[PDB]
C-alpha cells in the first residue's frame, strides 16, 4: 500500500467480537485511541451487539449524537471509539454503569457496577521517565501521562486513578502473593495469585499464577495486570471469579442447570 489502511474485513476482525459471517463484508475498524486495534472493543459493537439497544449502525449514531454515552467520564460521539480493558462506560439516561473486564473465555463481558465504583479505574504502569526540569512522568497502559508520581511506583505496578480529576489515589506493587489477571495469550481472562517470576535477560520474563482452586499456569510478564493486594481485588469481578472450567465440568454444570429448570 501507499499509506494507512482505512477498512477492516469482517472475517479479519478479532474473534472476541463474535461477529457473524453472513451479515456483511466489512467490520467496524476501530479508530486510533488509547487501546490497540486487536485489544479493544468498538463502541458500536458494545452498543448494538452486546446490549441490543440499536438494530443498525444508524441507530448507534443517533444514540451517540445525543451525547448519552460517556467513557471514563467524558462524552464520546465517535461510534468506532476504541474502548479497552478496565474502562468505565456510563449512560446517565438509563442510569447504568459498566466496566470492561475479560471473562474466562477471553471476551469482554457486560459487567454492571455500582455508580460509586464507576468513579475510579485501575491502570498498569508502562513507563517511568524524567523530563525537562527534572520532573518525573509516568505512562500507563491507556496512554495516560501523569506528572509527579509517587517515587515508590515503578513499572509493572498498578495505580488507582480517580476519573474526575485523573490523579493517583493509591497503588499496588508487583510482588509475589498479589492478585493478577491475564490480559493476553492462551490464559486470557484468568485470575490468580502470583507464585514466582522467572527473569531472562535479553528476552521475555515468565510469571507463574495459581488460581483459587489450585490450578497453575504461566504467562509472559507483559500479559499480567495486578488487580488487588493479596487475595482481595480492588474491583468487582464478573459472574465467573476467573476460574476456567474444563469442557467436561461445563457440560456437567449445563446438564445440572437443565435438570433443575422446570
Amino acid at each position: 500500500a501507499r499509506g494507512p489502511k482505512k477498512h477492516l474485513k469482517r472475517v479479519a476482525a478479532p474473534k472476541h467480537w463474535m461477529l457473524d459471517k453472513l451479515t456483511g463484508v466489512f467490520a467496524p475498524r476501530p479508530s486510533t485511541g488509547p487501546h490497540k486495534l486487536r485489544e479493544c472493543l468498538p463502541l458500536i459493537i458494545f452498543l448494538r451487539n452486546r446490549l441490543k439497544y440499536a438494530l443498525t449502525g444508524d441507530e448507534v449514531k443517533k444514540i451517540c449524537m445525543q451525547r448519552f454515552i460517556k467513557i471514563d467520564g467524558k462524552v464520546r460521539t465517535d461510534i468506532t471509539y476504541p474502548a479497552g480493558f478496565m474502562d468505565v462506560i456510563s449512560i446517565d439516561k438509563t442510569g447504568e454503569n459498566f466496566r470492561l473486564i475479560y471473562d474466562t473465555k477471553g471476551r469482554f463481558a457486560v459487567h454492571r457496577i455500582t455508580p460509586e465504583e464507576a468513579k475510579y479505574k485501575l491502570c498498569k504502569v508502562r513507563k517511568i521517565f524524567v523530563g525537562t526540569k527534572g520532573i518525573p512522568h509516568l505512562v500507563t497502559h491507556d496512554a495516560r501521562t501523569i506528572r509527579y508520581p509517587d517515587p515508590l511506583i515503578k513499572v509493572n505496578d498498578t495505580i488507582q486513578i480517580d476519573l474526575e480529576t485523573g490523579k493517583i489515589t493509591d497503588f499496588i506493587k508487583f510482588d509475589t502473593g498479589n492478585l493478577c489477571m491475564v490480559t493476553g495469550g492462551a490464559n486470557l481472562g484468568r485470575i490468580g495469585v502470583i507464585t514466582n517470576r522467572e527473569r531472562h535477560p535479553g528476552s521475555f520474563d515468565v510469571v507463574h499464577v495459581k488460581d483459587a482452586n489450585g490450578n497453575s499456569f504461566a504467562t509472559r510478564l507483559s500479559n499480567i495486570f495486578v488487580i488487588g493486594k493479596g487475595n482481595k481485588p480492588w474491583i468487582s469481578l464478573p459472574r465467573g471469579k476467573g476460574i476456567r472450567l474444563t469442557i467436561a465440568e461445563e457440560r456437567d454444570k449445563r446438564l445440572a442447570a437443565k435438570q433443575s429448570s422446570g
Binding site: R147, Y148, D150, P151, L152
Partner: peptide
Amino acid sequence: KNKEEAAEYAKLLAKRMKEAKEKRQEQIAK
C-alpha cells in the same frame, strides 16, 4: 496548577527521602 503540583511533590519527596534514610539508619545501627 504548576505551583500547587510542584509544592505537593516537594513535600512528598521530602517525606520519601526522610523515610528511606531513616530505614537505612535503622538497618545500619542494628
